[PDB]
Nucleic acid binder design. Sequence first.
RNA 1: CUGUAUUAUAU
Length: 408
Amino acid sequence: AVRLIDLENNASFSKSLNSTTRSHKCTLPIWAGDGEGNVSDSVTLQDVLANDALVEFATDKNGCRFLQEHYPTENDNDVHQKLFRKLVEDRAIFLSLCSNMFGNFFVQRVLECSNTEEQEILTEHLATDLYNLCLDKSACRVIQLAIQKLDVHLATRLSLELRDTHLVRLSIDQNGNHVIQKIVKTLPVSSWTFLVDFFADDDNLIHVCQDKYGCRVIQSTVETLSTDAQCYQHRVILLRSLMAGVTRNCTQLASNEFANYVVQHVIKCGDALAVYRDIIIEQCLLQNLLSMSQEKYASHVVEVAFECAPYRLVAEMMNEIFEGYIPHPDTNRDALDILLFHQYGNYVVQQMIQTCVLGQNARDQKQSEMYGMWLEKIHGRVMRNAHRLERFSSGKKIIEALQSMSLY
RNA sequence: CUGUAUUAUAU
């Protein structure tokens, strides 16, 4: 039984011959073509392996669809393994296919079929440049599928590769925001506690929450940390660290075109977020209800605060609108007068009516009487200005919300 | 006379 060392034949001019194509826009090798850009029916996966042409198919639309179609699913099939080997044998080739507009779709197909063994090498390849892959419009789709399908220790290793990176620039990126959200919504909190430490800084939190994309990152993190079933307070301490920055900067965030949505989320949530709801109303909304109610963005925040606040805070909000402001020196107009005829404030006055109408069904008699007293104050001002309000769509809806009402 | 986001890849 003499030994045989079988070295591989050097085929050093095969990429050179796969670079010949009919079209200059397509990469399909001419030998696989039918002349019309499609894959000739004589072609087999063994032909792609024999000619070392995996990249050139993967970078072509129809050749990549051919790869996705015929790739065996089972991990013990020999063609599966030889293709997987061609994919992963060179790290730079692998990462370039991940960043391609067409080849990424083959990489995802491999992940759909992968077992733990294949996932280890895929994870080792991806970790070497995870940050820039998250920024790429093609590769981020691979990273998100990897977060979904990988065993959690592998997905954790990859997620931890983002620690100490430029997470503002990544969180606000049109591609990377979805990678951060997929991590936060999918993986255990221990895999991304570094993201909560990053957002503890006020400047990072502000720069991210006031962004069309970053506000989604902050909101998905709050949703995950607030949903609970626990005996100690780990997610409690993490949530507390994040919410402190939101509460410290909620006056600016509530009036922002993007961050207003997460402030409303904190207020509508209740339960684990209820204490933070109360802080926002007391330290940001109060003393500012009139100005915020005339703003395009913050007027939605004031609506949800009237909708969801506990009675003790609804009372301070009500008392500010009816009694909190010095009437205008020229017009003698108070806050309710302004909001009744304002294009944004009319919506706040409508929530105030709805809140009071539903609060009349409250068990405590004093509360029911107090909600009725506020409705009577609104009814009176509306009557004094009905001749004008009935001409607007807002005033018609206000008058209809106050009809057939037994206040006490 | 009605009032705000994002919800992203196949030349």
